């Protein structure tokens, strides 16, 4: 149909502090959750079935991300490290050391030979997955780095910061290609490339999501009606059915907009705290949502459209 009809299917309990992020495995099999409780949990994507806990970080985790082949995870922790995990064995393969403050955000490149990280230390780091060596340190920002993401061919990195900037980096050289957002304020709390790599979705802490044309460097769409003044809340392109934008919200709801029209097409109610993270299943019309410490649950929602 023209609108989605996401309905609650499962509630996933077990984290003992705020959930920080949820991500679907590229192969659709799994949901991974990270939490302030220092743990990663793996869940069945379709039935919410608890699979395993992955442990090792000495402090809370802000983010977790999947390799392209669904075999590895990378986590970003307040212990100033990232850890690369074998999902099958649950073992830590590498500890990525070099950040001087909390590591907030992380992603594999499509090749999954590199990891990008952003930290409270105001740097972006590019790591070799095989060796766990830091290849490049980018002096990217003048305040904590809120998000990092590679584009579809891995040639570009997009970063965002509380400094109010969105910057695009050449992966090979680490050199800045452009400053896409150049305001003193507000803080840019989230950024990611569109599936096709032509657009950047950016959240600012003035209750606003914006879709930017990367090449032209101008704003194509604005999404409002949600609450976002404090937290680095993820946002998604939903592509399996209708073409939506999905975001959590500080009013404890998930918001879904029509990408083209910018109209809100659904609000998902159930969480009892800030929805910090949403993920869209790679093949099925399924949303995962995760909430802060008054809730500490993950919800799986499914839609016919
Ligand atoms: C327990 C509190 O979790 C958080 O506030 C972390 C949320 C978070 N947002 C991004 C966006 O790149 C990474 N991590």
From Swiss-Prot:
One GO BP annotation of this record: regulation of embryonic development
CDD domains: WD40 (cd00200)
Chain positions with N6-acetyllysine modification: 83
GO CC, one annotated term: nucleoplasm
Keywords: Acetylation, Chromatin regulator, Host-virus interaction, Isopeptide bond, Nucleus, Repeat, Transcription, Transcription regulation, Ubl conjugation, WD repeat
Cross-link (Glycyl lysine isopeptide (Lys-Gly) (interchain with G-Cter in SUMO2)): 17
Resulting phenotype, residue 196 to A: Loss of interaction with RBBP5 and reduced ability to stimulate KMT2A methyltransferase activity in association with RBBP5 and ASH2L
A Pfam family reported for this protein in Swiss-Prot or TrEMBL: Beta-prop_WDR5
Gene: WDR5
Organism from which the protein derives: Homo sapiens (Human)
PROSITE patterns: WD_REPEATS_1, WD_REPEATS_2, WD_REPEATS_REGION
Binding partners and assembly: Interacts with PAXBP1; the interaction is direct and links a WDR5-containing histone methyltransferase complex to PAX7 and PAX3. Interacts with HCFC1. Component of the ATAC complex, a complex with histone acetyltransferase activity on histones H3 and H4. Component of the SET1 complex, at least composed of the catalytic subunit (SETD1A or SETD1B), WDR5, WDR82, RBBP5, ASH2L/ASH2, CXXC1/CFP1, HCFC1 and DPY30. Core component of several methyltransferase-containing complexes including MLL1/MLL, MLL2/3 (also named ASCOM complex) and MLL4/WBP7.
Protein name: WD repeat-containing protein 5
